[PDB]
Symmetry: D2
Subunit: 347 residues, 4 copies
């Protein structure tokens, strides 16, 4: 089968011809019908997230097929698989745990001590077929098609968990930083669909700000055209925002938005652009603000985003679909910030 | 009446003779029987917490009587006060809110927009008498004497709130940084009394480490005699700690202990030594750690620490009591780190 | 001023001429612009909730002006009131606490040991003016008019609290019993606006079922035309519902809907029709279901429903407005179940 | 191997000679070193819990080996088992789920749609060996011996979950009904070890009341010697208790203790004696009390009780150990209420 893999750090992904794996035990072989392209693949291709080298620091062994936003058709199942037939369309949660470690036992599968992350340290969906380590991480699609579903296995589940950690309610205001992108448009949608909170989206490109407006943001700010702090101060009447979901975490965002936090404000850190958080400690203490990291999601979150989307309450804003052979171009679009919403590969 | 007040920044507190206030409305005039000395008064005397000047940045108007760990006898009450008689011994929650702002309405009175903090921006207990803005912030002592009670209105309520925010349970390990001090000995006790969690206390003085051992810590480390990270790594079997309560937040603690956090670890920031938090953002995100500020406590927290102490489940470790005229010497002991547990003034 | 009061149990409310109270201290005199009519006033007029006599069992002292859904204009304030001017339009939370008891201290003011409930044990809004015990229980209207606001001080805040206690999320299904009524239409809206959960509304009148459909229910059932259990079984695919908000709690509802609960299901009991809950204990234990009572709401809940409505995310379905002199007729409509949505008096 | 099994309802358990199962896949064959005797086995032998027949209503297929408090030595593992060696001493969580259903995905394994409950619908520990469906449900003992550990797999995990659902804190009072029994002594211990709450234990036998006193109860009541309601009213100063953990749920307890609940009180229903809950609905609503069922525990709870016990913070009060051949006599002791604490079989 054809596969687009990360063969060498700092080089374009490589289109290779490799064998189709045989599913055994609880594994499932999925015929890929859609593979979302995440800005994380820009970092993968660069070989790192900040100063955390995927090889030396995270244990990633090259070559590896990328693609962790997964949706497809069941081709073959192992002997232990129960509840699926050939042809069934499913979304796949790629953040899998082995089930016995501390984190797996308390329902935090994605923080497993021996993680199996399809598209990161295990082969992903940028191919004709993909192996699912365990069938319990799949979701039978009922209303969604594969293209709409794929993005939910990362951008959806990640922002669903992030919106929950932001502890939002009708009396609060949320600020989404980088609201016009893949996760940004998703964070805005979920917050609109289930929190009742007022939403402010900020980006730095005309089309991105427009995308955030389309995603449902009550207020949108173009940080290139105006001072976002003055505007946020105006919108919240000097109270500041109760929560920020930063989908960048660059020196540009981290040196600005934490100052917009209200007392008890939660700064949810999702983006992986690679900067260092730097804030005066007494200021954190006196305002009781929090800086909380959020990583993809667990089985519970997956269930949550999939049911929300199946109900039509949220829907990935797919602005572009292209062939698997165009994986590098789709990634260049994110690296050059020439994309909005989400792009999906349709092998 | 005699009062020890902060008259000038960077100078010794001043013993003055001032008028005794007349309680009106819901106010209450308390005859001070005990006034705890907090390391925060070292910062007050220096005129700042980190680079946050108490005058220009926090609105503190000099002169102001210090002393926010309050316990005493009811001398006189206003016309609105209901439920107290002259002579009743009470502990006083000094972190008072006006009751109508957003934070007061959601039960976070210490984060009131118009805070009345006895000993900080309003006169405190380093005097013969002290005015209590509102009687609902008092607790009638049933078993505790004034000396034992006073420290609970700051070191107790603060660390009670911090231990709650650390989200501890029997499967977790807590690390208390500066465990031999006033708050340190209290954090260790509360965590021992109600979380079931394993406790590690770290300090840098032989007597402090011993105090932390006496407070109930399962493991104690003298960071002056050995590498605390190697030891914490050994105790937690390389898992790291699920929570840290840092009662320093100095460049020395912040550049070390965050590295000891396990995945999902919570770094509760209480200390006000004045450094800057600096940590690689991708590391925060990938391990889902959190840096959360905690400030004194609300009416709910107060109730919690007072009942815990009245039941004899925790008890401030008072290692020294002295006269009100000795306020500066007691503060010097904290500034020079020549104290353990808690010191209390007995006017 | 004119007032419609409960003078005698089992008799029509009485239109009387009484003196206008003078606001002192933190009290506020409100010129009533709208007074919602709640089915609770049907019980008040009958002198009881189930077998709990309002006089002998609850301490209600007759005569008392009814009306606890309050919205109006500030006429006069006491000496302590801060932040309001004559003419300001406000909604009033009638479930007031004195502020010092255990329940007031933990932010559950409606469960105060010495409750001041306007319209129940204190004079209410079925009059030209009404006294507000404490100004902190008011909310300044920004977008809502008085008629739209009034119902939020009971049907809104109550069902907001009930929807929160139902612990809903996108993977869950909520069942609202009596969904076409005043609270029913509100419960459905709030659940639609902030939980992401699938909603099933059930009633027994064609117009009520239609109202519930208009409120946003995904599925509606007329228990008079069909077996509600068979239908709920079909909709949830035999899983049952994760939560039920019963706005009746009659022998007719309690002997039916608890059987529709899924494992861990929460049966939120709001209605006061007066029956006895009867369920096999082993069944409760083995399926971990819960029967939880919910009563009006606290200051936090009030804030939540008011902000949700001001944002236009929910809006009371007012199906009828009439003059204060018509109070008895409006109550008869609820007693005879010849009403849907909410009725509001406009003195 | 020898096994004590439920062969016929209403008859004494039968000592049979059956084959030793062969562990395959993730299964594990454990050599039983201790098997706790639970009052649930009295109900099993009677063929029902209340009016819920274990055969017709729960799907239990006879014959079945009883015994769900499990601790033993690893004899043999399947091909998928990872992390264990022959001889390793482990405690076994018998409340196992298949891992794919809704409840398994949200971390509520014990509420699995296709439950595998060792000792209930699958063979248990009342034998020489026992098969563990999945190895991830085991806990490697480090400090506890098998006899001390076994009881934690039911009485411990169940009461750990129940104490957590009681939402206890230092300002609250807990009432344990049947506090001198197997679960009672455990509930009292855990509440003493991790809640900070004041504890009241009630029983009706002199030795049972004494056992509850030894378990750590602050107050003990013998309901045979005095009116428990008058005493509870006295202890709580008429406030009532914030939580009740009823380990009976008989007409005798259910018609008494709910009346002792404070406003917002939580009545946790654990016992399976078989009565019907009957309480006036308006009373539930007006006091916001809750009746919540609690069933054994999930993987998270198991981790919690095992770590609490390994730390020596709680310890089953084993008052009797006897041979496997004496299973019926041990059960008669519970059925006749001639036992306190916990009894363990040592095959
Ligand atoms: N924590 C997790 O589990 C997780 C999961 C998925 C992706 N991510 C990370 O999230 C980040 C975003 O991913 P994505 O797929 O949404 O990317 P994207 O390229 O679709 O969107 C990024 C957005 O950031 C905006 N942006 C750039 N500079 C900005 C500035 N100075 N201020 C405000 N906005 C700015 C862009 O205009 C763009 O709309 C990446 O670093 C990715 O690796 C994290
Ligand atoms: N956030 C809040 O609401 C709040 C409330 C009260 C106090 N505080 C702050 O908490 C801090 C501690 O106050 P306290 O009264 O306990 O002080 P303290 O002087 O009693 O104790 C401080 C402890 O820190 C230890 N220490 C010093 N250097 C150390 C190092 N490098 N590593 C480890 N331990 C070290 C000392 O030996 C001492 O035992 C102060 O900065 C104070 O202002 C904050
Ligand atoms: N717990 C609280 O704090 C609180 C607050 C407000 C009102 N209430 C109580 O809530 C109840 C409802 O009040 P409301 O103002 O919404 O009343 P309402 O008269 O507006 O609505 C009641 C609804 O119940 C429906 N109904 C009647 N019989 C039914 C049956 N057998 N099955 C299903 N639906 C049926 C009616 O058709 C109607 O739509 C009253 O008992 C009231 O006292 C409680
Ligand atoms: N929900 C669950 O998951 C779960 C788990 C284990 C056991 N259980 C159930 O818990 C119940 C208790 O089990 P156990 O093993 O502790 O039993 P046990 O026999 O050890 O203890 C029961 C206690 O109840 C006391 N008692 C009897 N009548 C009483 C009365 N009128 N008032 C107060 N106390 C009274 C006895 O004196 C005795 O100490 C059983 O019905 C059992 O099936 C439930
Ligand atoms: Zn991604
Ligand atoms: Zn794992
Ligand atoms: Zn202090
Ligand atoms: Zn305030
Ligand atoms: Zn009402
Ligand atoms: Zn009160
Ligand atoms: Zn049992
Ligand atoms: Zn299952």
């Amino acid at each position: 089968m054809r596969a687009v893999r990360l063969v060498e750090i700092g080089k374009p992904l490589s289109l290779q011809e490799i064998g189709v794996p045989k599913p055994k035990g609880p594994q499932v072989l999925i015929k890929v019908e859609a593979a979302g392209v995440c800005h994380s693949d820009v970092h993968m291709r660069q070989g790192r997230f900040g100063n955390l080298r995927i090889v030396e620091d995270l244990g990633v062994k090259l070559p590896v097929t990328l693609g962790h936003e997964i949706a497809g058709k069941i081709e073959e199942v192992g002997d232990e698989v129960v509840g699926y037939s050939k042809g069934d369309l499913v979304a796949v949660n790629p953040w899998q745990g082995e089930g016995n470690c501390y984190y797996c036992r308390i329902g935090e599968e994605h923080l497993c001590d021996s993680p199996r992350w399809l598209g990161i340290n295990f082969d992903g969906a940028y191919a004709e077929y993909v192996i699912v380590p365990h069938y319990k991480y799949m979701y039978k699609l009922r209303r969604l098609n594969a293209v709409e579903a794929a993005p939910l296995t990362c951008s959806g589940i990640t922002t669903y968990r992030a919106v929950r950690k932001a502890s939002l309610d009708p009396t609060k205001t949320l600020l989404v930083v980088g609201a016009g992108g893949g996760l940004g448009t998703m964070a805005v949608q979920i917050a609109k669909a289930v929190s009742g909170a007022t939403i402010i989206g900020v980006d730095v490109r005309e089309e991105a700000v427009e995308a955030a407006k389309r995603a449902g943001a009550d207020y949108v700010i173009n940080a290139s055209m105006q001072d976002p702090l003055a505007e946020i101060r105006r919108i919240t009447e000097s109270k500041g925002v109760d929560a920020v979901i930063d989908l960048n975490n660059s020196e540009k965002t981290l040196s600005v938005y934490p100052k917009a936090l209200a007392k008890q404000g939660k700064y949810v850190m999702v983006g992986l652009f690679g900067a260092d958080l730097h804030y005066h400690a007494p200021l954190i203490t006196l305002s009781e603000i929090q800086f909380v990291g959020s990583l993809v999601g667990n089985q519970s979150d997956f269930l949550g985003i999939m049911r929300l989307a199946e109900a039509g309450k949220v829907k990935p804003m797919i602005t572009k679909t292209m062939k698997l052979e165009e994986a590098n171009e789709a990634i260049d679009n994110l690296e050059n910030f020439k994309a909005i919403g989400r792009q999906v590969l349709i092998p």
